[PDB]
Amino acid sequence: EQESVKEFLAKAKEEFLKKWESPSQNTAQLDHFDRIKTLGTGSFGRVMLVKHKETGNHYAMKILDKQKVVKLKQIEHTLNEKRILQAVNFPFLVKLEFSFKDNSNLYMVMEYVPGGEMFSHLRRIGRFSEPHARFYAAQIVLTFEYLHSLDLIYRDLKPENLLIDQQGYIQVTDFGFAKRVKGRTWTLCGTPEYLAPEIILSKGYNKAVDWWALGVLIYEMAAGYPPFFADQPIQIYEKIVSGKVRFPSHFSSDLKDLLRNLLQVDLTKRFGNLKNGVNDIKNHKWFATTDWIAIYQRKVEAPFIPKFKGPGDTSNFDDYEEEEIRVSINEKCGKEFTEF
Ligand SMILES: COC(=O)[C@@H]([NH3+])Cc1ccccc1
């Protein structure tokens, strides 16, 4: 690679490692914020729009219930998520602003991106044109080059985790499955339609799973549906492992060729995982129009700007029951979460 890229990534890794080795902790508290709206809710956590009472800034606060994290065997994953997020810095990664814990919950306070999930926009328009899909894909390629150079695997690429910001660029959110891995790792995680075959088959897998997931994402952006779609997970998994994918006739030949190379079942043949690494992707004809530096510098005009009224607008998110943020009188699971 150009010495320019090598030197950039060396500095990126140095800066990451300093924060990785000495993580920030306990940088705000709950009563510094007002709750505005619940933006998402799951089996062990929620995301809420909050406002800082002194500065007036809006943030997305992820709240994890310690007891449920333990019950669902997510302890290490939650520690990974926060330790990684506090240490990374890249234009297409959502910024962690504060973190803290209390007797009941873990809190990560992040930039709020009012444009909403790529998923919503994709489903509302049907499919993205190839230029539009390529603009987003280029951001993911650069983000994975950054993450992988820090020995990080992301492991949850899907349209719901990609927020569209005020300039129309992507912000990757949700580092719940991200992990620092030199070599292989084994945990079954991700989302069914996006899992690489080696995850399904319970192998020791590596960063090549992220490049597989990029193939799934690009297909879904350009087609409007994912390549291995089926009604139940087991049927999805059978399709993933089969080595068979069908492409819409509207796909360009270049798109089909790139996707066949990202969706290689044999991980030793998969683009992003060959001897030339990410450059096989960056140099592919489908990316011939992409100015990688201009994308990194946010100098390209985006395909669209989401419609929203301001930094507190929640219109691009959907409606959930509002539930308490209860804090027990007694500390729960203190030992498990000491490092948070
Ligand atoms: C496309 O490149 C690849 O798949 C590389 N693993 C090179 C290779 C090809 C065939 C057999 C062995 C090795």
Side-chain angles (χ1 to χ4, degrees), residues 36-48:
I36 309 301
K37 176 180 184 67
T38 298
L39 306 176
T41 194
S43 55
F44 58 92
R46 291 174 276 184
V47 178
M48 289 191 192

Side-chain angles (χ1 to χ4, degrees), residues 51 74 102 137 150 153 186 218 233 262 265-266 278 292 306 330:
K51 185 174 171 182
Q74 295 302 306
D102 64 23
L150 302 180
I153 312 177
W186 283 262
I218 294 174
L262 292 169
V265 171
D266 180 341
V278 71
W292 294 99
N330 300 288

Side-chain angles (χ1 to χ4, degrees), residues 108-120:
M108 287 171 279
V109 182
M110 298 168 275
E111 189 171 326
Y112 176 54
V113 185
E117 295 175 6
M118 180 193 291
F119 183 77
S120 301

Side-chain angles (χ1 to χ4, degrees), residues 56 100 210 271 278 316 325:
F100 55 94
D210 279 339
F271 266 28
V278 71
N316 288 286
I325 303 166

Side-chain angles (χ1 to χ4, degrees), residues 261 268-271 274:
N261 284 293
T268 76
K269 301 190 179 299
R270 190 176 304 148
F271 266 28
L274 308 180

Side-chain angles (χ1 to χ4, degrees), residues 192-237 239-243:
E193 292 281 0
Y194 279 75
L195 297 183
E198 58 269 30
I199 303 179
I200 291 162
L201 297 173
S202 205
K203 295 185 174 170
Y205 62 86
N206 63 23
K207 60 189 177 74
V209 304
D210 279 339
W211 297 121
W212 173 282
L214 177 62
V216 180
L217 184 77
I218 294 174
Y219 185 115
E220 182 166 15
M221 290 190 293
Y225 52 87
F228 304 108
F229 185 82
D231 189 67
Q232 291 294 302
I234 178 60
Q235 300 163 322
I236 298 171
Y237 300 153
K239 295 178 173 187
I240 289 165
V241 301
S242 73

